[PDB]
Design a binder for this molecule. Structure first.
Ligand SMILES: Nc1ncnc2c1ncn2[C@@H]1O[C@H](COP(=O)(O)OP(=O)(O)O)[C@@H](O)[C@H]1O
Ligand SMILES: Nc1ncnc2c1ncn2[C@@H]1O[C@H](COP(=O)(O)OP(=O)(O)O)[C@@H](O)[C@H]1O
Ligand SMILES: [Mg+2]
Ligand SMILES: [Mg+2]
Lengths: 133, 160, 74, 375, 82, 82, 375
């Protein structure tokens, strides 16, 4: 296996994947707008009158009730899913801990640095103590 | 990659001091200035730094495509100073989660060699025989045909 | 449980969100603007509902993945 | 699959919860129904120790738990634990939210009303199902055999009941429910093992005794001859390796444990065995459908899986019954899941699709709707 | 004093050689520890997979025995009903 | 001269410590060599026996399939007999 | 490092005090725990002679001191000396004032309460730490191995204790604490050396006998064969140079000193060896976790560093245990500091950060807080 070629291929693939994700998000946004125009047909009020306004008011109230109930059920589902996400995050945290907590440690922060001072300190202490006269 | 110039300009003194000490240990006279990587690895071992050396030795056996065997500053200097973690931010975990969810057209929690080949044909890279086996190593840590998102995360984590 | 608190919260939200019901007491333009604004509001609510539905499906898939993880741990 | 809506055929049982979507051959997830809190102290920090392991997870950590079944004899004695079991069954073993699926529970005959009403109230309030229906555990086992008549002896793990049915018309005055079942056989086996030196006391070791019973015990064709043979030769002594070594040798305890079914005087019960309560259940029926019931005797339930029971029971009934009638005992190889297979078949029927207890109906009449026309 | 200085420098070069030998031994030690860790992990996996295989073989053997005996009995009964 | 002699004594103790290091390194290394070899041999044997068990299990699968088919046949014969 | 606050993982032990900041690999300062007053008169004036040399300083002037350990068998018998040892450890070996650092002491199982309460009272009143926590010396050694089950035999220098743990749930009824340890082996070696002519009596010469034990003694794989071989050949006699010359030759005293661990009848103790108290500790556990304990037997503590003990112990347990179970003995190369490494890991955990005994809590409930929920 190579080193540089694999690096460049991986980098290019990651960048292309991000571009694909962004364009897919844009396409999904366009489709969501299309579905908005379908389910919520835009109203052109050109040459309009009172009667269409009142019909719009009544249909709007009924649709507000329906969509509010639908969105309430969806939001309750969302809350349940968020709680499940929290529980699964906690479990994965616990499992990764029981895996890698012993491996996660500060190995010899200063014990590696402190290597030779003790011997010289002992010898120099003996010599300094002898050095009274 | 070609991070050589930005790297030779970007190094901060925490590693520049040891670079200078290794330079002094290396060059004492009657040298061509190319700085033989074989002595460089031994010098860095003497310095006490703790990266992984076997990959460096294999690279020198392969890299510097003309096969000179005496790496000039760029590549072997990078392999030397590779003690310090100057990584590509590790990307973002949520970004990779979104990518892997996108790639899971199977919608079965994992992506296999067929989907990897599909993405490769979508981009158009040179076909490699290391395929299949690379998925077996990185994504298949369970030998079950299952790959979770952390496998793709650590597949190219902080890749430049 | 889990059958009455939801109903009361939903009715309270309905009361606070469904405003006063009075139209024909005013001019045509004021009612026209009010209806247009409420229609755009329900359009925004519907768009948000569909986006949250897609996000809920994605998070259901993610919950399935995490379930496969907790199954892999045993 | 796709659009449309499939039904959840759950089957609470007592000892093994069997569940799965309607229209398949076998239950999707089968796991013991035990909920065991830990009993020791626990010193490791951050180990992620939960407060109650349910289902098949508590059969692997049973060394430090105190397993306790939430269903004693058909009836449910601990509603919180049963709710926990149902929640686990829906969310982790099937991973389908109950808000979008009808459910078909099963219940033993002659059970207390309050149990059934509480069951439907839970299913409608906590899990919030669209519609649920409760069915008698024997009619399903008759569905699975593809018959339409016959007297079915459904010897589960909690309770053994014997429902005779003719031409689709159940006979409510001839149901003979007896409370001897697999659990009492486990306790009796655990009690007679002490005659060789092996003492099992902990609620965790009851599972080991259950495994011994499943793997070794068999029903003797003739009891006295087997008792005489096992007391002279040694061709019966089969050994078994405990979960830690120290193999044990079971002698004539092999066929004495399941013999309790045909002589309930062993565990002090007064009533007659499963060989004579079937004949009594038949004799309560009318004089003109006794031949058909004799010819279509059906076995079901887990405890009827002992090797050699379909011959002992036939011999006993042939001894009791008149000499002219033909006695036939239907013992399908898929005995254990017979009730659930029948439940799947019943839930998959088009004619049955309007018998569910719809939620609006429950909202109008309360939990007492189950005793009404929607049975 | 001159003789002592000679011995001092000789012991000095000896001490440097000693330090180098020490570092070489240290590296060898780290290396062998790594190897042993790897091989032991492999031992764990090998034993566990062996156990899985043995258990499955046991279960299949038992089921074969049961079904074979049932088939033999039913064959005898088929002759009987002939 | 006395200062030089003190230096010499220091060098002597350091040489002693170095030889001590050498001996302990050798001992531990030989130990790990023993463990390495034993682990490797046992790993080899365990893999071999596990594969053997796997083969036997597959054979058992095929046997069970044969028996299942024959039981189906006998059951059909018996029911028609009835 | 910098801001923030690190914990002090001290580990009193008995024979070697091991201390260091939490989150490292090895203790920062390891030194014998001995306090020795001078015993002769002293004629030089102004020499700066102190009244008590503690720690590693008294292992260099031991020729004119009377060293005396302040910890006999786990318990602490001389509180003033122990306070002196702690003061030295904090101020001279680590040079960190205790006013700004939590501490995590360690204590053997089944020790007197008063010892633990006095320990916490000292740490809170004299040294005035922010918060201290006391942990059992075996759970830490189980942390360091990265396991979560297993039965750990922590044969220190004061006391040998054997704590079995499963899935993080310690089994308090199966702890077998035995008071034979390294110190008794030193005394027995000093007593059997007299059979060749070498007499060590002074409390300073006990250190020389300890060095002999560390450098020469080893555990025999089979005792009788070694006794027979050492009595015929002379391939075992290893020589050793005393601190003044006059080399000595140790014959079959080499493997007879550490054999006392497996036959405590040598020093007159009644109990069974460390090879049989582990099996007894296992057999007290439940029947379903014995396989896991058999497979994950852990060794720790200093005295388990004898060359060849991990094979003798495995042979003995394999002789005792059932033939089917696999016996595996985990003997990491970092055995001596295993308890302290585990202590560092435990102190570095985020989940553990709220278990410390905060000072305000001690002010409200007194020293008896340690037996309460904050264990
Ligand atoms: N192969 C078998 N041999 C003997 N007894 C069995 C066997 N399988 C299950 N049993 C007994 O049957 C019980 C399971 O019965 P089951 O039909 O699951 O009860 P339920 O009606 O509650 O589902 C177990 O407790 C066990 O004692
Ligand atoms: N390399 C060794 N070989 C044999 N015995 C040893 C060795 N190192 C230490 N010991 C014995 O172990 C004791 C130290 O045990 P240690 O684990 O420090 O006790 P504690 O649990 O009090 O810290 C010493 O007294 C010594 O007798
Ligand atoms: Mg049943
Ligand atoms: Mg200790």
């Amino acid at each position: 296996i190579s080193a540089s070629r694999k690096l460049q291929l991986k980098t290019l693939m990651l960048q292309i994947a991000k571009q694909e994700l962004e364009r897919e998000a844009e396409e999904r946004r366009g489709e969501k707008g299309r579905a908005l125009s379908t389910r919520c047909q835009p109203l052109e009020l050109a040459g309009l009158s009172f009667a269409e306004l009142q019909d719009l008011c009544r249909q709007l109230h009924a649709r507000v009730d329906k969509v509010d109930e639908e969105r309430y059920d969806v939001e309750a589902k969302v809350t349940k899913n968020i709680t499940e996400i929290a529980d699964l995050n906690q479990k994965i945290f616990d499992l990764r801990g029981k895996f890698k907590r012993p491996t996660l440690r500060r190995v010899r922060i200063s014990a590696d640095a402190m290597m030779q001072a003790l011997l010289g300190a002992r010898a120099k202490e003996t010599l300094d103590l002898r050095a009274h006269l | 990659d070609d991070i050589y110039k930005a790297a030779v300009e970007q190094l901060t003194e925490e590693q520049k001091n040891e670079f200078k000490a290794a330079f002094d240990i290396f060059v004492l006279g009657a040298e061509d200035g190319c700085i033989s990587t074989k002595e460089l690895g031994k010098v860095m071992r003497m310095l006490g730094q703790n990266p992984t050396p076997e990959e460096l030795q294999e690279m020198i056996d392969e890299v510097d495509e003309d096969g000179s065997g005496t790496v000039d500053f760029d590549e072997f200097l990078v392999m030397m100073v590779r003690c310090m973690k100057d990584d590509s931010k590790g990307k973002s975990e949520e970004e990779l989660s979104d990518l892997f969810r996108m790639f899971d057209k199977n919608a079965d929690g994992y992506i296999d060699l067929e989907e990897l080949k599909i993405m490769l044909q979508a981009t158009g890279e040179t076909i490699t025989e290391d395929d299949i086996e690379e998925l077996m190593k990185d994504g298949d840590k369970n030998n079950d045909g299952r790959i979770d998102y952390d496998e793709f995360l650590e597949f190219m984590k902080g890749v430049e | 449980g889990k059958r009455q608190t939801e109903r009361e919260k939903k009715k309270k939200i309905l009361a606070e969100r469904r405003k006063v019901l009075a139209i024909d007491h005013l001019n045509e333009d004021q009612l026209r603007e009010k209806a247009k604004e409420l229609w755009q509001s329900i359009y925004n609510l519907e768009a948000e509902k569909f986006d949250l539905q897609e996000k809920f499906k994605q998070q259901k898939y993610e919950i399935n993945v995490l379930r496969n993880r907790i199954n892999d741990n045993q | 699959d796709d659009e449309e809506t499939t039904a959840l055929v759950c089957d609470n049982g007592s000892g093994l919860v069997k569940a799965g979507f309607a229209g398949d051959d076998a239950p999707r997830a089968v796991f013991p129904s035990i909920v065991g809190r830990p009993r020791h102290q626990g010193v490791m920090v951050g180990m992620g120790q939960k407060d109650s392991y349910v289902g098949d997870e508590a059969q692997s950590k049973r060394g430090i738990l105190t397993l306790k079944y939430p269903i004693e004899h058909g009836i449910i004695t601990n509603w919180d634990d049963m709710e926990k079991i149902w929640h686990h069954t829906f969310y982790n073993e099937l991973r389908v939210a109950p808000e979008e699926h009808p459910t078909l529970l099963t219940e033993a005959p002659l059970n207390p009303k309050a149990n059934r009403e509480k069951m439907t109230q839970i299913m409608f309030e906590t899990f919030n199902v669209p519609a649920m229906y409760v069915a008698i555990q024997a009619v399903l086992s008759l569905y699975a055999s593809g018959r339409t008549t016959g007297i079915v002896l459904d010897s589960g793990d909690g309770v053994t009941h014997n429902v005779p049915i003719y031409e689709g018309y159940a006979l409510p005055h001839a149901i003979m429910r007896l409370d001897l079942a697999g659990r009492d056989l486990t306790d009796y086996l655990m009690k007679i093992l002490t005659e060789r030196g092996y003492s099992f006391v902990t609620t965790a070791e009851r599972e080991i005794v259950r495994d011994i019973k499943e793997k070794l015990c068999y029903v003797a064709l003739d009891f006295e001859n087997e008792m005489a043979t096992a007391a002279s030769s040694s061709s019966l002594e089969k050994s078994y390796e405990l979960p830690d070594g120290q193999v044990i040798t079971i002698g004539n305890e092999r066929f004495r444990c399941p013999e309790t079914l045909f002589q309930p005087s062993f565990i002090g019960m007064e009533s007659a065995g499963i060989h004579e309560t079937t004949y009594n259940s038949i004799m309560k029926c009318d004089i003109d459908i006794r031949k058909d019931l004799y010819a279509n005797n059906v076995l079901s339930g887990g405890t009827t899986m002992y090797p050699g029971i379909a011959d002992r029971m036939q011999k006993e009934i042939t001894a009791l019954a008149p000499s002219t009638m033909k006695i036939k005992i239907i013992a399908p190889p898929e005995r254990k899941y017979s009730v659930w297979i029948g439940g799947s078949i019943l839930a998959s029927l088009s004619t049955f699709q309007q018998m569910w207890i719809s939620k609006q109906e429950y909202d109008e009449a309360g939990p007492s709707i189950v005793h009404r026309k929607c049975f | 004093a001159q003789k002592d200085e000679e011995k001092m420098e000789i012991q000095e070069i000896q001490l440097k050689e000693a330090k180098h030998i020490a570092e070489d031994a240290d590296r060898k030690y780290e290396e062998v520890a790594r190897k042993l860790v790897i091989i032991e992990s492999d031992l764990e996996r090998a034993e566990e997979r062996a156990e899985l295989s043995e258990g499955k073989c046991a279960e299949l053997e038992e089921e074969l025995k049961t079904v074979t005996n049932n088939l033999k009995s039913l064959e005898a009964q088929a002759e009987k009903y002939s």
